[PDB]
């Protein structure tokens, strides 16, 4: 397997894209957190703020050819926060869809959202549990990755199933159906919502799905396939993180955290 010729150029281009994304996010996420301090929307925004705050660490890691100079605790905390917040946002999208459907509760909201965060942290805990940093014996470079039990490295399949089965379809179906019903009842932003939530996240999961199919040796091994998958994955991830910024587009984004002579008659 030769080395990728234009890996550095693509990484730098997507790093500039990540810089734009991180600036815009930090802005519009710290802004939302400060300013709204709906309840579910508030929880979602608080969640997304952490992902955005962690974006710079991921950008730095990408800049060094996916080498993690920071310590093991840094990678653990960053990955745990990223996973927790991403899952929390994904789930609260469906939760808000359901709440909007029901409305057209005070004792409900608080317990419901605490339970949503409970699920968010629980589902994401196993990933961080086995995360560790190791230095390549030959490449002599540091990296951060998960180390599942040797006899059941089953764990990968289960985690992927949880990521995809729980991730995309479960929200998407309810969200699309409920917003179609809302459109039938009725404004235009409604359509935007649907498309956004699809286009933002529909790609990566599909790409993720393809990754699974490649891990199970269901496709012939070729360098061009690997290059295409690598190019698509990071672009899809950038489009996903763009969700952190476009979420506060259902509502305006206010950046609150930033000669005349007097003659007479």
């Amino acid at each position: 397997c030769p080395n990728m010729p234009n890996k550095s150029v693509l990484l730098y281009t997507l790093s500039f894209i990540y810089i734009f994304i991180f600036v815009i996010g930090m802005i519009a996420n710290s802004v939302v957190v400060w300013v709204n301090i709906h309840c579910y929307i508030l929880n979602l925004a608080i969640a997304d703020l952490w992902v955005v705050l962690t974006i710079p660490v991921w950008v730095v890691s990408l800049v060094q050819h996916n080498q993690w100079p920071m310590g093991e605790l840094t990678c653990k905390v960053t990955h745990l926060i990223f996973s927790i917040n991403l899952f929390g946002s994904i789930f609260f999208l469906t939760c808000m869809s359901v709440d909007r459907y029901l409305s057209i509760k005070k004792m409900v909201r608080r317990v419901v959202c605490i339970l949503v965060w409970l699920l968010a942290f629980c589902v994401s805990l196993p990933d961080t549990y086995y995360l560790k940093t190791v230095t390549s014996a030959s490449n002599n470079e540091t990296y951060c990755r998960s180390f599942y039990p040797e006899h059941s490295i089953e764990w990968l399949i289960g985690m992927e199933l949880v990521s995809v089965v729980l991730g995309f379809a479960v929200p998407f179906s309810i969200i699309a159906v409920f917003y179609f019903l809302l459109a039938r009842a009725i404004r235009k932003i409604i359509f935007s919502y649907v498309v956004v939530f699809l286009v933002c996240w529909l790609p990566y999961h599909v790409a993720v799905l393809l990754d699974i199919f490649s891990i199970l040796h269901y496709i012939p091994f070729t360098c061009r396939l690997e290059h295409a998958l690598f190019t698509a994955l990071h672009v899809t991830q950038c489009l996903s993180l763009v969700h952190c910024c476009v979420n506060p587009v259902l509502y305006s984004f206010i950046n609150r955290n930033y000669k005349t002579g007097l003659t007479k008659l």
């Binding site: 991921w58 890691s61 990408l62 996916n66 993690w68 990678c75 990955h79 990223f82 996973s83 991403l86 899952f87 994401s124 990933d127 995360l131 990296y143 951060c144 990755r145 998960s146 040797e150 490295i153 990968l156 990521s163 991730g167 891990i215 091994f221 690997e226 690598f230 994955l233 990071h234 991830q237």
Partner: peptide, 14 residues
Amino acid sequence: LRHQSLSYRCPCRF
């Protein structure tokens, strides 16, 4: 949902 930077790409993972 480990970021692709943390994701390890090699023929074998187990």
